[PDB]
């Protein structure tokens, strides 16, 4: 028996809107859960057609089972399966823009089904997000704390901008296993390395994550 194998697949579906622009994201990927690695290709379709009017970084961060966990730290995310895992996240950008996103992750065979709801609001029309001036998120380290059966993630993110420079964004996330987790972990960290390769409305993503400390 092996609920999560060294190699797994992913299918993504998102219903979203940013500054009133409605859109859907669909994609597929493959990854190595125990190695904290994942790769995927995502397609953005605007409700009114046309190019996506915002930088993909706004939604790129939208799959913890794909985190390399040392045997010293219980793996809450993989333990949540096959029952399922859900998470909720708030984003606070330095120029006033903000967003709320929640996702449900289910498992069937060797494939994870990732479905999300994303609503972004108040982004300045001339800011880097709506002007598509950001490039990638800087690598980061998220603080993970346990609380009454769920996990809390806290990380201050920095968006790399084209002309150089950074744009701050605070992430606050709640991770919820579908069923009661036997072994809860103590407080620790998860370092992330998320990079994108974007060609218009299509984007390829790669993320490497490792839990530690």
Automatic annotation (TrEMBL):
<dbReference type="InterPro" id="IPR011584">
    <property type="entry name" value="GFP-related"/>
</dbReference>
<dbReference type="Pfam" id="PF01353">
    <property type="entry name" value="GFP"/>
</dbReference>
<comment type="similarity">
    <text>Belongs to the GFP family.</text>
</comment>
<dbReference type="GO" id="GO:0008218">
    <property type="term" value="P:bioluminescence"/>
</dbReference>
<keyword id="KW-0157">Chromophore</keyword>
<dbReference type="GO" id="GO:0006091">
    <property type="term" value="P:generation of precursor metabolites and energy"/>
</dbReference>
<dbReference type="InterPro" id="IPR000786">
    <property type="entry name" value="Green_fluorescent_prot"/>
</dbReference>
<keyword id="KW-0599">Photoprotein</keyword>
<keyword id="KW-0455">Luminescence</keyword>
<protein>
    <submittedName>
        <fullName>Fluorescent protein</fullName>
    </submittedName>
</protein>
<dbReference type="InterPro" id="IPR009017">
    <property type="entry name" value="GFP"/>
</dbReference>
């Amino acid at each position: 028996v092996s609920v999560i194998k060294p190699e797994m697949k992913m299918r993504y579906y998102m219903d979203g809107s940013v500054n009133g622009h409605e859109f859907t994201i669909e994609g597929e990927g493959t990854g190595r859960p125990y190695e904290g690695h994942q790769e995927m290709t995502l397609r953005v379709t605007m409700a009114k057609g046309g190019p996506m009017p915002f930088a993909f970084d706004l939604v790129s961060h939208v799959h913890r089972p794909f985190t390399k966990y040392p045997e010293e730290i219980p793996d809450y995310f993989k333990q949540a399966f096959p029952e399922g895992l859900s998470w909720e996240r708030s984003l606070e950008f330095e120029d006033g823009g903000s967003a709320s996103v929640s996702a449900h992750i289910s498992l069937r065979g060797n494939t994870f089904y990732h479905k999300s709801k994303f609503t972004g609001v108040n982004f300045p029309a001339d800011g880097p997000i709506m002007q598509n001036q950001s490039v990638d998120w800087e690598p980061s380290t998220e603080k993970i704390t346990a609380s009454d059966g769920v996990l809390k993630g806290d990380v201050t993110m920095y968006l790399k901008l084209e002309g150089g420079g950074n744009h701050k964004c605070q992430f606050k996330t709640t991770y919820k296993a579908a069923k009661k987790i036997l072994k809860m972990p103590g407080s620790h960290y998860i370092s992330h390395r998320l990079v994108r390769k974007t060609e218009g409305n299509i984007t390829e993503l790669v993320e490497d994550a490792v839990a530690h400390s």
